[PDB]
């Protein structure tokens, strides 16, 4: 099957954040994304990019962005990793979130973890 | 102005790649991405999101993503950061390129890096 | 607190990578590490900082290097994150890779990636 | 080589930070950081590990860490790069910062960012 067959549908994260994905014919990622920690309420849209034509044993790679907007939060997203549909499909995960700042403090505006998504919430 | 109408446009990094941008009113970004590094050759599209409502002073977080697929290449990267449209326009990111492998090999499959876009090529 | 009490001893990551640390009373770390995974087939030296001091219910922040070289690979590593003793024993980390390049090419230079560290090998 | 004759000394980044670096015959890196960014008000002593035999036309791949400890900061920095000695001098890093929190808060407790040192102060 296509990578969008395996790959659209909802995935969830160890912080119990919850994606709901899908993969466009064209490459194209598009969604909402739930998050559960920060200062957020309500799912936020995404836009992204993924492989179509990953070499056989290897991950799709990909790669996605949120804004998040509200009273007190400007900042965006990206998640970059590696999504594998074989045996136990999971999306392996880096992103950065930047956050609005003044020019003077870029320096301390970024922020880097790990969120590997399953198609099960954890416990 | 709204964002849009300082965002949209050509920009180029310090390695001289150069991205085609269109921010949208949606908050959406798309366009082209043209990389003057690695084994890739022409233009790539991609898809992103920005922030529309910038606190005075403040940059405009976003992030885009491309999706690499070539003879060779089969990659993603995200670019994070903030686009700041007073004075001297520039677009400061952090990236992530991820790239495909075994599920064995993840570890090392996730480069990170820094692009400094501005509105002129560098000589 | 005394933080060298539950920090120095052997740590084992989820790529079965063993570290021998050892936390000194003026806040450096030394010690080896084993990786299981790269071209690298003996122990390394380590060198880094930790927090004495940490507030109540919360991490010790650490950093610490390790320059990897033999016949094929001029690298270095470092880990920056967090220590938690109190329960579950855990650092956990997410580290920067660099390795040599020439100048031109510093933009493929740098792996991102994290690892959780453990008193216990993982089966 | 002969590295530590071209690595130590001090060194100035973008941010006007401080570093006064030793490179020791061992492969060790000590020294002092003067952050002119950050709630820090003195130097806070480093160690690290760096590349003693670089390839010709190559980097020397090197990384250090800085634990800061004052009443209301319990973080540590780690950086990772290459340091180019053969014409205009640099070290180029990208660095984490790992603030202390609880073990619930440690997707926002680490930063990423870039350093460039060169060994003259910026104007
Ligand atoms: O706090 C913000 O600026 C907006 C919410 C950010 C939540 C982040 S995105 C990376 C990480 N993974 C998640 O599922 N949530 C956090
Ligand atoms: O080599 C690949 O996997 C595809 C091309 C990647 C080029 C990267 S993306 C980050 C950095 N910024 C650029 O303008 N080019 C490189
Ligand atoms: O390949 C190299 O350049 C040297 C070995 C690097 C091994 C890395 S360090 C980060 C990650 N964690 C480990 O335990 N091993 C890999
Ligand atoms: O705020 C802190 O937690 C301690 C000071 C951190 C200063 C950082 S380290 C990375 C960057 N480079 C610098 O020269 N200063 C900042
Ligand atoms: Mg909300
Ligand atoms: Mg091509
Ligand atoms: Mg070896
Ligand atoms: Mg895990
Ligand atoms: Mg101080
Ligand atoms: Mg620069």
Same mark, same amino acid.
């Given at each position: 099957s296509?990578?969008?067959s395996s790959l659209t549908g909802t995935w969830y994260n160890?912080?119990?954040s919850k994606m709901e994905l899908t993969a466009n014919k064209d490459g194209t990622l598009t #969604?909402?994304?739930l998050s559960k920690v920060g200062d957020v309420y309500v799912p936020y849209?995404?836009?992204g990019r993924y492989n179509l034509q990953?070499?056989?044993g290897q991950g799709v790679?990909? #790669?996605w962005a949120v804004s998040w907007e509200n009273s007190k939060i400007h900042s965006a997203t990206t998640w970059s990793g590696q999504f594998f549909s074989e045996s136990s499909p999971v999306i392996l995960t880096q992103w950065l979130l930047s956050s609005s700042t003044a020019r003077g403090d870029?320096?301390?505006s970024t922020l880097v973890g790990n969120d590997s998504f399953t198609k099960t919430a954890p416990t």
């Open positions: 296509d990578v969008q160890e912080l119990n #969604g909402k994304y849209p995404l836009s990953p070499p056989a790679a990909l #790669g870029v320096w301390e």
